[PDB]
Every structure is written in structure tokens, then in C-alpha cells.
Amino acid sequence: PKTPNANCAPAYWNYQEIRLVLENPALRGQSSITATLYAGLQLIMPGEVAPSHRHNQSALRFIVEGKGAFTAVDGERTPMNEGDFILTPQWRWHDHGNPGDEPVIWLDGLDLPLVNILGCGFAEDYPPVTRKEGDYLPRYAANMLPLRHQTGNSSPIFNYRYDRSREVLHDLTRLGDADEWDGYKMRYVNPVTGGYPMPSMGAFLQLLPKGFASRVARTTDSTIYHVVEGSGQVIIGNETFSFSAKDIFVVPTWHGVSFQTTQDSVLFSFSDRPVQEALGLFREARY
Amino acid sequence: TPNANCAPAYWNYQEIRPLLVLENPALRGQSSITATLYAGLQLIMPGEVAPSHRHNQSALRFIVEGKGAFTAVDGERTPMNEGDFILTPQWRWHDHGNPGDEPVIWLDGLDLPLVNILGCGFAEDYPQQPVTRKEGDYLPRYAANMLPLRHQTGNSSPIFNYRYDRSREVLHDLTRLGDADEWDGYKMRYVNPVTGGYPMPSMGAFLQLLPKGFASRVARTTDSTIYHVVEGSGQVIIGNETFSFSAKDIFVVPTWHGVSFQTTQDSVLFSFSDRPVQEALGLFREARY
Amino acid sequence: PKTPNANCAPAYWNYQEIRLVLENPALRGQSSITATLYAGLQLIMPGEVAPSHRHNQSALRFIVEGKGAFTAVDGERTPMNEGDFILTPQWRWHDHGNPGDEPVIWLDGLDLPLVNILGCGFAEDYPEQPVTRKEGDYLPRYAANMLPLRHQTGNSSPIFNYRYDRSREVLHDLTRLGDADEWDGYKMRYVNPVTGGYPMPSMGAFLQLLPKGFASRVARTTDSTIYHVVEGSGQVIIGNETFSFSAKDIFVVPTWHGVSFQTTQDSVLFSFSDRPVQEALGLFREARY
Amino acid sequence: PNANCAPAYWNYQEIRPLVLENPALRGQSSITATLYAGLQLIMPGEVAPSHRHNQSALRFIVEGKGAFTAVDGERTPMNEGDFILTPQWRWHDHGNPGDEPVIWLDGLDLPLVNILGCGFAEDYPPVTRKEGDYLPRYAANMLPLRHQTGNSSPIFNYRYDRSREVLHDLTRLGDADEWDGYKMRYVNPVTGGYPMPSMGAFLQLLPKGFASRVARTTDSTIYHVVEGSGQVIIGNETFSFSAKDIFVVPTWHGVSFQTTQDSVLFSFSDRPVQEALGLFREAR
Ligand SMILES: [Fe+3]
Ligand SMILES: [Fe+3]
Ligand SMILES: [Fe+3]
Ligand SMILES: [Fe+3]
């Protein structure tokens, strides 16, 4: 088998859908956007709350629209705002609600199909705030850490705020030239290990300035992209798609990808890269 | 609450020896012994030689029978003997031959299904591959508790033959030193000497002696497991199924299925699984009842 | 011994010694603050330019006073403000300037004694060093909880300036969130965002907040510590001996000497030790009484 | 680099008739700035009480059959050339219930630990493990499933019969390195790392008429001739050597050998700590 087999097709969804909702490709009725990962959208209507649970599946939430909701992790709440990269770690209590006036929508991504082929699905229901909102900020997210922290699997940061993260990308355009494949791209980091925010999924935020025509890249990580702002086209080895704000597309293994933008576009992505790099199977080609 | 599915399976060596023979559980069509792992009986007949190739799927070969063939890795050849845990590490050239009489059969293990779902399948042909390293080279270099001061291996173990003469005598020395674990008997894990880790990044491999008359306690793990009976006989209990086993048989213990063994005869069980990947993702879990 | 001999003796200096000036305890003539670390006071006069070099000795610079000056590391330069914990990683070119008025003094900490004992002292002058990197480049690239994708690093925190204004705000933000640790106040370790570990391999660095009125319990650690009052005032009880402290002073707690505090104002202490080397060797130890 | 110690050599046999090995650091009781070395004798029928300290130590047997060292449960015979470890914070003792004097080369990290301030130690307020237990458990490329240890190799005697046979096996597998001959580092099978965190140990075989070229490293190294004879150069100041002699190459002093026999050299230094700090260097 020279070169990676498909396992997943290129795929586009224009954020004119419902408006929970699964997104799947060439894996019809497998509930999975990739062969490894799951993606879908989720709505919480005003007043709704959810009970708190825990499972081995890892999960990220990237907020699409709506303010006044919150997600809690292990007793701590964090406000969800547009573009926030919220995580709920793999064996930590989580729940949410909005006592607000706005429907709130987000992108969920979980490694359900991967945990399912590894055989490692466990889940339990809670039988308790105790944790001031905003705690994780100074405790883990200003380049310093408590003396006796101790964790294994982590990222005590469960909200990579957009206002922060977007700002990074913008400050970087004053400081150098864009990379010709990816624009101004950065990976979200676990400040305890320098590693991935979560063990199975890696996550990225990238800016592609107006008028950008990057080159062709391939990676082994089938990749779920999400347009947080901006617009233009993408080419996914051959197939082309037009994208506008809040669309979502998937780039399968070894499919060349390129971007041609007509606005300053900020793309969010995630994939099983960490699992690949852990085994020594990640591979990249810029051409 | 748990899950998981590859189904318990058994194959008897006498009713399957009349033959590569892929074996699947209840994933029929999927060329796979587990949801992540592939396993087969390979046969190389006197006079056969396979050209050199490389692929980033990791692989192991446990010799079931036959003497006189050799496997080669990145240069050096190694004789293949009954019970040898040989491996062809990931992106490193490999080939094999049988310049002897006697047909040589072994058990193949590959993380095929796993690399296909991850998307990382590359492979290529040697452009054979001259020897370079005297046969036997790796044993003083990497197998005697020392190591060269300036060596750059990578992801996998420079020992590509963990020999049974050596490994069967560990388990045997261990019985005159102490109690047998009550679930496992005398079980040990093969180890990469450069890192202390698993021999290959995606697969783990274990050997275990279960003394004659042994009746272990029930255990579960998250890592679905492929067992090979290298020697011995007895009964096994896999979550709701029970098999009688004998020399060379093969059985699979799917995730979170209770295993326990009942032995007549000192039985040596080789197995393997995708444990390293679950430990790498903080998903491995064990319950010993 | 039973408990660490450890020698450097308890010491206190007092910002009354205005003067490139180092501190020695009871190790006279060794230019050592402790048995592994050097500490002193360097002044840059309004106009000076240091040429640029690299050495195996790690170094930190913690600004005590004056404004206008900069330091550069591998090309990029940053402003120096009161309370800033700046590094010059080992084997990477560094220099500074003062194009301003106002003399600029800082505390130097370097692993000088240690590296001599270990035998690892290399020193190179640069041939006549340009910019390369705009000012405030490391901030968004490494200090905002994200990293570049193909970034190459080595043992070195790419963050060379842990600003005080961000750092002081952390400890403040901590007071609003919970009680004070009974032994340290509100204490945090500066962290290498690439690794999560120590900013330098031989040196560790802390910032703690000791609210007004606080009366800590007594603690001990094997790491001989250099404390520096960025602000505030109070008492310190360093194993049987006690010192009065005020803004900018420095004092040393030698290994396994009990340390406790009693502040009359909200106090903020900078400290560093050879902790990292002791943890790397599994020799670090603390008792919280 | 400065490196504060000097080149030293001691003629075994001369010295032979515990003994501390001090260079030009007169009084510091340290063969290097970081390590201590010395000979220890254990007369027939003498037994030492069990004790422990967070200082690391090794023992390389010089001579004498009979006798053993016990570590946390198990004892091991001491045979000429065996690299025995007493990991930090693990009870150790020894004894010989046989005839004959038992000499051994002592290596410890004492200067390092004082300079760091981490000296703790206990006088043991007892078997539990059969002799040779560690050999199948740890030293046959396998390991127990639920091992867990740290900061220490579970193998506590790297038998010279084995170690020596490695070096021998290697002369049949390829050529000598122009600098070291056939050299090799002992390893912790649980980590692939060094047997203890502060000290690294090597065994090298210098063939018959070998004549190495010049090397430098930043770790002050202690050599001990297990067998053979020859000359050594240590940044100037050469030395002629023979069985069981010991010498020291200070940091960034060039080292070379010229042998007349087929000689084996055991060595230990503070390399682990260096490389851990990113401070280790080497020139050929
Ligand atoms: Fe959930
Ligand atoms: Fe193959
Ligand atoms: Fe300097
Ligand atoms: Fe001792």
C-alpha cells in the first residue's frame, strides 16, 4: 500500500444547516467526520441546563454563536464566547447551561470512533461548583504554575479564549512574513507539558490574510476545519469549495490543501495528529 | 460503562495447519483479528526468498514451527526458531528466506487496521539489501545490559529477535524464585533496551507461564489480546466463552472480557495487543477480580 | 549525614549597599551566594553598550530599579522593567544597553560555582550582534498559550522576559481566588511554555505573595534559596535566626533551614535556587511543618 | 573550561598494603570535584550493618572470591570485575563468610551531594529475596508488568563474566573505534538510561597493540584497569599502567591509550548530571 488509503472523503458543510447535529462523510451512518474523530453542532436553548457527567472520550467545543451560556469542568465555570476553544478533558466532570436569552451553538469534536476501536469507552453519571469562575486564568495561563500541581493527561486550561488567541494571530502579522502553506498558524498548548491540549486531538488556529493564495500541503492527519471568520476558496486535492463564515470542511489524509482567500480568514482545525505523532506515523509534505 | 467489539475467537492448529492464512473474529471481510490488529499464519517453503521492503506498519513474527529459515532487518539476518519473538520495525527494510529443507511457519502480527483508520499507510520496495552486519550482531550490542555510547535508534527496539531459549528460561527461573501472580502466573513483557518501553510503538508483546494445575483468578483489560499457545494445554474462560486449548492454538480476548485459565501441563502463552497506544492516550485500564 | 550538612550560611544584605557587586555569605572569596550559585548586583550607566557573547553558564536578571535599558537574546531585545525576570539562556548570544538616562541595576543569578565544579565552562565572544527579531516577538509566539508548529528548542525557555506587570497580576489574581498557602503565601513557579518545566535546566525561579499580617508556618527544602524582596516588608526566621526586611533586600535560606515569615505589608518575594538539578537527580526534598 | 582537579594515577600494589583516593584537592576527600573514589577491604568473617543514604554508590570488585553485597532484600556474590550498585535510598550491607581478603573500588557522589545540600542518611532499624532474583526479572530483555521504580536500575551487579563477553563479542563483529577501542555503557533496563542519576559507568576493551587518538570530554573520569597494560596520556603528564591501577582524566584534558596486551578499562564519571543540564561536550 503505497500512500495512504482514503478512509474519509473531502467534505463541506455551509453553515446554512438545521438553521445536536451529526456530520459524517463516506462513512454514512457511522456518526464520524473522520475515521477517527466525531464532529457535530450543538444548540442550547435559553434556560436549558445539563447534568454533569464524565467519560474516557476527549472533547472540545468551539463556540459558533451566542453569549450568556457556560460550560463547567470539574466544578468550574467558564463563559462561552464566540471563537473560544473550550475543552472537557477525558475523565473530568463537565456540564453546561444557559440561564440567558440567546440560543448558543457550538462545534463538538470527540474521539468517539477512536476510543471505540481501541476498546476504551467508560462513562459515568455524577451522583457542585466549589471553584470560582476565572480560576484557571492566573493559575495556569500566565506562564506560571503552582508548586505541587501534579497531573498526567491534562491541560488545566479549558478555555482558550478567542480574544486572546485571535490577538496572537494578529500580532504575529506585524512581526514577520506568512508561511506560504499555512499563513500565520499556531497550535494550542498544554502549559503543563508543552504538549497537546488533549492526548488524542490536536488543535490549531490559523490566519490567512486577504488575497492569500497559499501552496499545496499534505498531512496524515485527516483534519476538520471551521471558518471562524473570513472567506474564500479551498482546494482539497481536486475538489474545490467556497467558504464563508462558520462553514466547516474536512481534509482527509494525504489530500493536498490550499487556500485562496478574499477576506482575512481565521480557520480552526483539529485532528488525531497527537495519536499519530505518539506512534511514529505522522508525515507531512509541503507540495 | 465499558464497550468494545471484536468477539472472542479460537482457532485450533491441527484444523488449520492444512495450508498466509488470515484469521478474523466476527469482523468477517475486514481482514483483522481485532479492531486494530491483524494476525495470520505465514508459510515460507524451502527455496523461497522475499525481496526487501519497508512500510510504516509495524510487524512481528512468532515462530510456530520449522527450522532453517532466516529473517532479515536493515542488514542483518537472524535465524528463526520455534518461539522466537521477531520483529520488523516500522520504517526499516526487511526480507526473509528458507535455504533449508523444512517448511517454516510463523504468526504474523501487524497494526494494519490501526494505521488504515489513522491514515498513515506508506510502503516501498528496495531499489535485496546487502548484509552489512554479521549475524548475531545485535545481541552484544543491545541485548546484554549495555549499549553503544553513540547510537541513534528510534521509535523501536534494536533487538529484532527475542529468542525463546532466552525468554522461556526467564519464565522458568522465575518459578523457582516465587509465587506466581494469581491472575497471570509468571508473566513478563518484552522490552526495548534503549527506552525501557514496548518493542514497537503500536504493539505490546508478553510471555507467560501458567504452571500445571493452575486456575487463575478473573481479570479484565482494555486491550483486546491475541494469545498464542507456544506449549501446553488447558482451558480458558473468555467473558461467557470457554475453549479447550493445545499447542499452537490461537485465541482472542476482547476488551473488558473476563479472562482466566485452567491448566494441565505447564503452558506457555505468548500474546500481544495495542496496549501501547491506549497507555499513550491515557485510556488503558485494568481490573483484577 | 543524617540531614544535609549543606553549607552556605543564613545571610541578609539590605539595599543600603549602593555602588559589578556580588554577594558572598560565609563562603568568603569564592564569589558564591550559595555553594552552587552566584548572585550579585550589576549596574548599567546611562550610555553603556555591552558587546555580545555566549557561555555555558545559565543566567537570570531580575530588575530592581531604573528605566530605559534593554537586553538582547539571540537578536531580539526587550525593555527592562522593575520586577522583570529575564533570562539569558546558555549558549545563546546575549547583550544589553542603556540609551536612556537613569542608571539601571539588576540582580544577577548564574550557575557559575556549579558549572566549575562540573567542568563545563565554555565561553565565546561574538565577532563584532544584529537585531533579527522585532521587539515583543516572543510574547505572542510563546507566551500566549500557543506555540509554532515546526519550532526547534533546546533546554531553553524561549520566553526571555516574564514581565512583572503580568507576574504581579497573577499573584494578585490569586488572592481573589482563595486562601493563602499557610507556608508560602501565594506562590507560583515561572514555567517554560515548550516543556512545562524550569526556565533553565540548572535554575528555578519563584514569585510569591505574602499578604500583610501573614505569619507563615515553617518549611524546609534541600535547595538553598536566594530571596529578593521586590516590595513590601516584614520578618524572616531562617532556622533559629531572624531578619528584618524591606524593599529590594535579599537573603539566603540554606538547605534544610526552617523558614517562616511575618509581614507588616503585602510582600512579594523573588527567589531562585538549584532546584532543577536536584529534581533531575531524585534528591529534592521538602518538609512542611 | 577550568576543571578543578588534576591528572592522577595510583599504582595498585603500592597502596594495596578503607583507602581514599585524593588528587591535588588535598583534604577535600574526593578523587574529582564531584565524585569520591577509594578502595575498601573486608577481611574474612567481617559483616557490616545494613544502612542507606541518598548518596549513590557503586563498587567494582578488585579481587577476592567469597563475599557478597546485599541490596534491599537480596544478596549477590562479589566476583572480580563485577559492577555492583547500591542505589540511593535502598538499604545495603555486605559480608564474607569465606577466607581471603575482598578488595573493591568505591565510587560515590559525596562531593556533589554536599555541594547540593541533599545528604540524608539512616542506620537500619533480613532476606526476602533469593540470590540471582534480579537476573531473569530485569536483565533478560523483559520486565514485570506492574514494575514501577525510579531513580535507579533494579540490576545491581553487572557481572564481569557477562560484561566482558560483550566486549569480546564485539571484536568479532567489527573494528575498534579509533579513540576508545570497543567501549560500552552499562544501562538501566527500565529506562535505557544510566544505572544511577549522578554517575555513568563504562567498560572498554583496548586491544593488543592499539594506539588510540586523542579525545576530550567534560566529565572528569576515573579509570580502573581490570586487566592489561600499556601507557596513557592525560593532557600532557603521561603514565604507564597495569592491572588494577587507577587514574583520572580531568575535564578537557585529552586522553589516549597505547596498549601492550589486551586491556579492559572501567570508568565512571558525573556525565549523567551534565547531559541532564545540557552541559556535556566531547571532541575527537
Ligand atoms: Fe460529555
Ligand atoms: Fe513487510
Ligand atoms: Fe554574560
Ligand atoms: Fe553506604
mmCIF file with all atom_site columns, C-alpha atoms in Angstrom, chain C residues 1-7 34-36 56-58 90-91 111 114-122 124 155 201-202 221-224 255-256 274 276-278 280-285, chain D residues 1-4 32-34 53-55 88-89 109-110 112-123 151 197-198 217-220 251-252 270 272-274 276-281:
data_model
loop_
_atom_site.group_PDB
_atom_site.id
_atom_site.type_symbol
_atom_site.label_atom_id
_atom_site.label_alt_id
_atom_site.label_comp_id
_atom_site.label_asym_id
_atom_site.label_entity_id
_atom_site.label_seq_id
_atom_site.pdbx_PDB_ins_code
_atom_site.Cartn_x
_atom_site.Cartn_y
_atom_site.Cartn_z
_atom_site.occupancy
_atom_site.B_iso_or_equiv
_atom_site.pdbx_formal_charge
_atom_site.auth_seq_id
_atom_site.auth_comp_id
_atom_site.auth_asym_id
_atom_site.auth_atom_id
_atom_site.pdbx_PDB_model_num
ATOM 1  C CA . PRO C 1 1   ? 24.959 12.825 57.239 1.00 0.00 ? 1   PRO C CA 1
ATOM 2  C CA . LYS C 1 2   ? 21.611 12.297 58.732 1.00 0.00 ? 2   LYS C CA 1
ATOM 3  C CA . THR C 1 3   ? 20.336 15.627 57.408 1.00 0.00 ? 3   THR C CA 1
ATOM 4  C CA . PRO C 1 4   ? 22.038 17.837 54.853 1.00 0.00 ? 4   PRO C CA 1
ATOM 5  C CA . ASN C 1 5   ? 25.286 19.413 56.069 1.00 0.00 ? 5   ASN C CA 1
ATOM 6  C CA . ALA C 1 6   ? 24.704 21.858 53.422 1.00 0.00 ? 6   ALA C CA 1
ATOM 7  C CA . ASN C 1 7   ? 26.740 24.881 53.823 1.00 0.00 ? 7   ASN C CA 1
ATOM 8  C CA . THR C 1 34  ? 25.488 29.509 47.965 1.00 0.00 ? 34  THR C CA 1
ATOM 9  C CA . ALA C 1 35  ? 27.553 26.516 47.120 1.00 0.00 ? 35  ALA C CA 1
ATOM 10 C CA . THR C 1 36  ? 26.190 26.199 43.597 1.00 0.00 ? 36  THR C CA 1
ATOM 11 C CA . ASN C 1 56  ? 27.527 27.560 29.156 1.00 0.00 ? 56  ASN C CA 1
ATOM 12 C CA . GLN C 1 57  ? 26.594 29.180 32.474 1.00 0.00 ? 57  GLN C CA 1
ATOM 13 C CA . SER C 1 58  ? 22.781 29.962 32.540 1.00 0.00 ? 58  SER C CA 1
ATOM 14 C CA . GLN C 1 90  ? 23.047 29.114 27.943 1.00 0.00 ? 90  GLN C CA 1
ATOM 15 C CA . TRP C 1 91  ? 24.830 29.135 24.682 1.00 0.00 ? 91  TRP C CA 1
ATOM 16 C CA . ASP C 1 111 ? 25.176 28.835 37.919 1.00 0.00 ? 111 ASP C CA 1
ATOM 17 C CA . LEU C 1 114 ? 28.140 24.597 39.744 1.00 0.00 ? 114 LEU C CA 1
ATOM 18 C CA . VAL C 1 115 ? 29.500 24.651 36.241 1.00 0.00 ? 115 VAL C CA 1
ATOM 19 C CA . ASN C 1 116 ? 33.015 24.985 37.502 1.00 0.00 ? 116 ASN C CA 1
ATOM 20 C CA . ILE C 1 117 ? 32.681 22.072 39.744 1.00 0.00 ? 117 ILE C CA 1
ATOM 21 C CA . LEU C 1 118 ? 31.222 20.069 36.889 1.00 0.00 ? 118 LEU C CA 1
ATOM 22 C CA . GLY C 1 119 ? 33.837 21.144 34.496 1.00 0.00 ? 119 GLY C CA 1
ATOM 23 C CA . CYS C 1 120 ? 31.666 22.746 31.703 1.00 0.00 ? 120 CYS C CA 1
ATOM 24 C CA . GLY C 1 121 ? 32.759 26.325 31.403 1.00 0.00 ? 121 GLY C CA 1
ATOM 25 C CA . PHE C 1 122 ? 32.770 27.360 27.685 1.00 0.00 ? 122 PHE C CA 1
ATOM 26 C CA . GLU C 1 124 ? 32.745 32.616 23.157 1.00 0.00 ? 124 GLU C CA 1
ATOM 27 C CA . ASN C 1 155 ? 16.614 23.312 27.148 1.00 0.00 ? 155 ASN C CA 1
ATOM 28 C CA . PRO C 1 201 ? 17.989 23.483 33.399 1.00 0.00 ? 201 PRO C CA 1
ATOM 29 C CA . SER C 1 202 ? 20.078 24.453 36.418 1.00 0.00 ? 202 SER C CA 1
ATOM 30 C CA . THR C 1 221 ? 13.796 22.307 51.410 1.00 0.00 ? 221 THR C CA 1
ATOM 31 C CA . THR C 1 222 ? 17.115 20.904 50.212 1.00 0.00 ? 222 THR C CA 1
ATOM 32 C CA . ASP C 1 223 ? 17.568 23.768 47.859 1.00 0.00 ? 223 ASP C CA 1
ATOM 33 C CA . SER C 1 224 ? 19.476 26.708 49.047 1.00 0.00 ? 224 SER C CA 1
ATOM 34 C CA . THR C 1 255 ? 19.298 23.773 52.699 1.00 0.00 ? 255 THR C CA 1
ATOM 35 C CA . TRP C 1 256 ? 17.072 22.198 55.475 1.00 0.00 ? 256 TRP C CA 1
ATOM 36 C CA . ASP C 1 274 ? 19.430 24.914 42.108 1.00 0.00 ? 274 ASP C CA 1
ATOM 37 C CA . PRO C 1 276 ? 16.113 21.729 38.981 1.00 0.00 ? 276 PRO C CA 1
ATOM 38 C CA . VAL C 1 277 ? 19.332 19.927 39.244 1.00 0.00 ? 277 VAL C CA 1
ATOM 39 C CA . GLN C 1 278 ? 18.249 18.284 42.474 1.00 0.00 ? 278 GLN C CA 1
ATOM 40 C CA . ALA C 1 280 ? 16.600 15.793 37.922 1.00 0.00 ? 280 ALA C CA 1
ATOM 41 C CA . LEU C 1 281 ? 18.683 13.665 40.357 1.00 0.00 ? 281 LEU C CA 1
ATOM 42 C CA . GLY C 1 282 ? 15.937 12.291 42.586 1.00 0.00 ? 282 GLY C CA 1
ATOM 43 C CA . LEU C 1 283 ? 17.408 14.297 45.552 1.00 0.00 ? 283 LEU C CA 1
ATOM 44 C CA . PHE C 1 284 ? 14.932 17.188 46.120 1.00 0.00 ? 284 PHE C CA 1
ATOM 45 C CA . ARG C 1 285 ? 13.069 17.105 49.434 1.00 0.00 ? 285 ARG C CA 1
ATOM 46 C CA . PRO D 2 1   ? 36.784 25.009 30.901 1.00 0.00 ? 1   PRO D CA 1
ATOM 47 C CA . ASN D 2 2   ? 38.876 25.159 34.187 1.00 0.00 ? 2   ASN D CA 1
ATOM 48 C CA . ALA D 2 3   ? 38.058 21.882 35.700 1.00 0.00 ? 3   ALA D CA 1
ATOM 49 C CA . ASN D 2 4   ? 39.373 21.838 39.366 1.00 0.00 ? 4   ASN D CA 1
ATOM 50 C CA . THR D 2 32  ? 37.375 14.612 41.337 1.00 0.00 ? 32  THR D CA 1
ATOM 51 C CA . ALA D 2 33  ? 35.413 17.773 42.136 1.00 0.00 ? 33  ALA D CA 1
ATOM 52 C CA . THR D 2 34  ? 32.234 15.826 42.142 1.00 0.00 ? 34  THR D CA 1
ATOM 53 C CA . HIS D 2 53  ? 21.768 7.287  52.299 1.00 0.00 ? 53  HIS D CA 1
ATOM 54 C CA . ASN D 2 54  ? 20.617 9.301  49.379 1.00 0.00 ? 54  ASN D CA 1
ATOM 55 C CA . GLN D 2 55  ? 24.220 9.333  48.071 1.00 0.00 ? 55  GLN D CA 1
ATOM 56 C CA . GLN D 2 88  ? 20.204 5.721  46.646 1.00 0.00 ? 88  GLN D CA 1
ATOM 57 C CA . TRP D 2 89  ? 17.791 5.299  49.446 1.00 0.00 ? 89  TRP D CA 1
ATOM 58 C CA . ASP D 2 109 ? 28.699 11.168 44.656 1.00 0.00 ? 109 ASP D CA 1
ATOM 59 C CA . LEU D 2 110 ? 29.512 12.743 48.035 1.00 0.00 ? 110 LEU D CA 1
ATOM 60 C CA . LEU D 2 112 ? 28.212 16.575 44.604 1.00 0.00 ? 112 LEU D CA 1
ATOM 61 C CA . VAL D 2 113 ? 25.654 15.953 47.211 1.00 0.00 ? 113 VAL D CA 1
ATOM 62 C CA . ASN D 2 114 ? 27.232 18.248 49.832 1.00 0.00 ? 114 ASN D CA 1
ATOM 63 C CA . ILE D 2 115 ? 27.685 20.962 47.348 1.00 0.00 ? 115 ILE D CA 1
ATOM 64 C CA . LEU D 2 116 ? 23.993 20.461 46.559 1.00 0.00 ? 116 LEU D CA 1
ATOM 65 C CA . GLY D 2 117 ? 22.782 20.064 50.126 1.00 0.00 ? 117 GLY D CA 1
ATOM 66 C CA . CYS D 2 118 ? 20.874 16.736 49.894 1.00 0.00 ? 118 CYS D CA 1
ATOM 67 C CA . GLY D 2 119 ? 22.664 14.429 52.272 1.00 0.00 ? 119 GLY D CA 1
ATOM 68 C CA . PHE D 2 120 ? 20.151 12.298 54.272 1.00 0.00 ? 120 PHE D CA 1
ATOM 69 C CA . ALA D 2 121 ? 21.106 9.010  55.872 1.00 0.00 ? 121 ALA D CA 1
ATOM 70 C CA . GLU D 2 122 ? 19.673 6.148  58.101 1.00 0.00 ? 122 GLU D CA 1
ATOM 71 C CA . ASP D 2 123 ? 21.166 3.342  60.334 1.00 0.00 ? 123 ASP D CA 1
ATOM 72 C CA . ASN D 2 151 ? 15.973 6.872  40.026 1.00 0.00 ? 151 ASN D CA 1
ATOM 73 C CA . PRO D 2 197 ? 21.302 9.523  38.056 1.00 0.00 ? 197 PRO D CA 1
ATOM 74 C CA . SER D 2 198 ? 24.527 11.179 39.095 1.00 0.00 ? 198 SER D CA 1
ATOM 75 C CA . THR D 2 217 ? 35.188 15.362 27.348 1.00 0.00 ? 217 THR D CA 1
ATOM 76 C CA . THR D 2 218 ? 33.878 17.477 30.126 1.00 0.00 ? 218 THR D CA 1
ATOM 77 C CA . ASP D 2 219 ? 33.327 14.722 32.560 1.00 0.00 ? 219 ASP D CA 1
ATOM 78 C CA . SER D 2 220 ? 36.281 14.128 34.943 1.00 0.00 ? 220 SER D CA 1
ATOM 79 C CA . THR D 2 251 ? 37.806 17.703 32.166 1.00 0.00 ? 251 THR D CA 1
ATOM 80 C CA . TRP D 2 252 ? 39.014 18.846 28.711 1.00 0.00 ? 252 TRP D CA 1
ATOM 81 C CA . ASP D 2 270 ? 29.405 12.606 36.569 1.00 0.00 ? 270 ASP D CA 1
ATOM 82 C CA . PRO D 2 272 ? 24.581 11.959 33.743 1.00 0.00 ? 272 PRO D CA 1
ATOM 83 C CA . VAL D 2 273 ? 24.303 15.201 35.554 1.00 0.00 ? 273 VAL D CA 1
ATOM 84 C CA . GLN D 2 274 ? 25.996 17.081 32.735 1.00 0.00 ? 274 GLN D CA 1
ATOM 85 C CA . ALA D 2 276 ? 20.787 16.374 32.041 1.00 0.00 ? 276 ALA D CA 1
ATOM 86 C CA . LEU D 2 277 ? 21.780 20.053 32.265 1.00 0.00 ? 277 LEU D CA 1
ATOM 87 C CA . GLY D 2 278 ? 22.685 20.245 28.595 1.00 0.00 ? 278 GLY D CA 1
ATOM 88 C CA . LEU D 2 279 ? 26.366 20.843 29.588 1.00 0.00 ? 279 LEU D CA 1
ATOM 89 C CA . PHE D 2 280 ? 28.140 17.782 28.310 1.00 0.00 ? 280 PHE D CA 1
ATOM 90 C CA . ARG D 2 281 ? 30.624 18.140 25.453 1.00 0.00 ? 281 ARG D CA 1
#
